[PDB]
Structure formats: structure tokens, C-alpha cells
């Protein structure tokens, strides 16, 4: 379910770059698109400077995401989390490490389930996310 959201979002982002991986989902896709628009107006894509490899990808994922949520959680930072995952996947497919896509997806799902789920449930669940971000 969280895992399902993750795979849908990543597949959407991959398709936008011409790559292919074969209400909540729609809200998240749109939120991701808006997040990325805002990001590009402010900061350069630093994804490349991470040097993603199979041996280092989890550690880069884990360290960024831990730092993202260190000060706290909100729906906007959760959108950032999904967009970041998307960026890691696009870079991965770009550089012919497409097997990392399924690993990043799993890492994201596990992080959601183990670490963001308590906050999500405390703040109305994904239903509240749809109320706030739906049709946008």
C-alpha cells in the first residue's frame, strides 16, 4: 500500500523521462510535479554529485532522508522524499544501473512503513493528504 504508492510514483517519474518500469496516487504525482518545478527554480540537481553506485546507493539514500526528517516531518517533506527517490531512479536508469530502481523503491517503502507511518497516522493518514493536495 505504501509500497504500491512508491512504485506508482517512481513509474510515473520514469515515464516522464521516457523510461519504463513494467486518488492518493494522482495527488502524489501532481504534488511531485509541483515539488520538482519549485525545486528547479531554486537549486541545481545535485543527484549526480552523489555518485550513485550499487554499493553506495543505500547509504546515500539513508543519509539524505535521515537528514531531511531530522528536524521534523510534514506533508511537504514527504513529497520531497518521493521526489528524491524519483531523482535517484532517473539517474540510475540514465547510467544503466536500472536494477537500482527496484531497490530504491523497496528502501522507500520500508522507510515509509517503519519511520513515517506513525506520523502519517497521527496526521489523518493519506486521506488527509488527498484532502490537502487533491486536484492540483
Amino acid at each position: 500500500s505504501n509500497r504500491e504508492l512508491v512504485v506508482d510514483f517512481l513509474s510515473y517519474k520514469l515515464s516522464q523521462k521516457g523510461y519504463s518500469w513494467s486518488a492518493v496516487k494522482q495527488a502524489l504525482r501532481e504534488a511531485g510535479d509541483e515539488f520538482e518545478l519549485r525545486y528547479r527554480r531554486a537549486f541545481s540537481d545535485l543527484t549526480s554529485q552523489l555518485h550513485i553506485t550499487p554499493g553506495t546507493a543505500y547509504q546515500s539514500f539513508e543519509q539524505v532522508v535521515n537528514e531531511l526528517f531530522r528536524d521534523g516531518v510534514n506533508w511537504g517533506r514527504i513529497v520531497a522524499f518521493f521526489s528524491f527517490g524519483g531523482a535517484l531512479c532517473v539517474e540510475s536508469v540514465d547510467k544503466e544501473m536500472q536494477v537500482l530502481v527496484s531497490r530504491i523503491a523497496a528502501w522507500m517503502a520500508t522507510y515509509l512503513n517503519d519511520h513515517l507511518e506513525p506520523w502519517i497516522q497521527e496526521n489523518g493518514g493519506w486521506d488527509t493528504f488527498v484532502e490537502l493536495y487533491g486536484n492540483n
Partner: peptide, 28 residues
């Protein structure tokens, strides 16, 4: 230039744009 510097920058950028996208209203 460091890996950890890159990490910290990305997370900071994500966090700031994330907060600009926070649509929640505090409870009344």
C-alpha cells in the same frame, strides 16, 4: 565537494522546498 557535504546540501534543499509545499493547517 565532500560526499557528506553533498548529502547535507541535498537534504537541506529538499527540506526547504518541502516546507514551501506544506499545505497543512494547524488544528483549531
Amino acid at each position: 565537494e565532500s560526499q557528506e557535504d553533498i548529502i547535507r546540501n541535498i537534504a537541506r534543499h529538499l527540506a526547504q522546498v518541502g516546507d514551501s509545499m506544506d499545505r497543512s493547517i494547524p488544528p483549531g
